[PDB]
Amino acid sequence: MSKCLQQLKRQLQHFGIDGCSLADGDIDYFFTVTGIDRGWGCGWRNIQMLISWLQYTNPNWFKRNFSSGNYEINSLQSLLLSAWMKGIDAEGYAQLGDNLHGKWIGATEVYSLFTGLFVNVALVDFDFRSEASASNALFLYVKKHFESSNDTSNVSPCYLQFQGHSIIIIGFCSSLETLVVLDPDRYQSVQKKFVNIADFNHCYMRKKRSLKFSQFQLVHFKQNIFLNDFSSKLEVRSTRISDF
Ligand code: NA
């Protein structure tokens, strides 16, 4: 689904869901297919969505990195290996020699790949004893991330990781205190007409009670989106938010 922020804004207005702040620019939706890349493709599909956001917001960066406009998963395997070979992620050598096809990837690989593309990546680690506290801190940070009063084009989507699954956060809904998300493992519940608000919510909204995890990893791009060199970003350094 191409340019899915324009249509999603219309659906939010149609269902009367107020208080939504979404990422700037636009984004394409990428999804896994059951019996093909379902169960390991989610992280790769989420990287594809983040690439599409960069594509809409800086075409020059996109032309420079994807000369044929091709960022299929095979292109991403080259970029991930390239980042490891350039010294990004101190522990990246531990995955040299693996098959990159079929490989589950996480926030560290998301950081490594985009850092190798000279993208300025922020990584936030939510690590709590209390499950309620973890979602409280996460939801507040994400809510503040998407809040913007001035006309900007640098509010990026977020990659959210929990328990091996990952999704893209494209906004926050303050009337419901829910994440607005693009989940690559829920293609079956998108490719049809939404008539009831309940089906829309199950697809695009994540309440705190739907994310009963005590650990989250969050990746997004910074206000200064692009780097001149990643020599200072070789080590994966996250900011840790915790109650212990
Ligand atoms: Na803005």
Residue numbers in the entry: 1 to 244
Show me the paper's own sentences about this structure:
The ZUFSP family, with ZUP1 as its sole human member, has a modular architecture with a core catalytic domain highly active against the ubiquitin-derived peptide RLRGG, but not against ubiquitin itself. A hallmark of ZUFSP proteins is a papain-fold catalytic core domain with the catalytic Cys–His–Asp triad and two conserved acidic residues recognizing the two C-terminal arginine residues of ubiquitin within the RLRGG motif. Except for the minimalistic Mug105 from S. pombe, all ZUFSP family members contain a number of N-terminal ubiquitin-binding domains, which are dispensable for catalysis itself, but are required for chain cleavage. Biochemical and structural studies suggest that the acquisition of two family-specific proximal domains have changed the default K48 preference of the ZUFSP family to the K63 preference observed in ZUP1 and its insect homolog.
Like mammals, the fission yeast Schizosaccharomyces pombe encodes a single ZUFSP family member, Mug105, which is much shorter than human ZUP1 and lacks all recognizable ubiquitin-binding domains. Interestingly, this fungal protein preferentially cleaves K48-linked ubiquitin chains. Since sequence analysis of Mug105 did not identify any ubiquitin-binding domains, we set out to investigate the basis of Mug105 specificity by solving the crystal structure of full-length Mug105 to a resolution of 2.0 Å. The asymmetric unit contained two Mug105 molecules. Mug105 assumes a globular α/β papain-fold structure. The active site residues (Cys-42, His-165, and Asp-183) assume a geometry similar to other papain-fold cysteine proteases. Overall, the Mug105 structure bears a striking resemblance to the ZUP1 catalytic core domain, with an RMSD of 1.7 Å over 215 residues. As predicted by sequence analysis, all ubiquitin-binding domains of ZUP1 are absent from Mug105, and no additional UBD candidates are apparent from the structure. The Mug105 structure does not contain ubiquitin, but the recognition site of the ubiquitin C-terminal R-x-R motif appears to be conserved between ZUP1 and Mug105. The corresponding Trp-104 of the ubiquitin-less Mug105 structure is mainly adopting a conformation blocking the substrate-binding cleft.
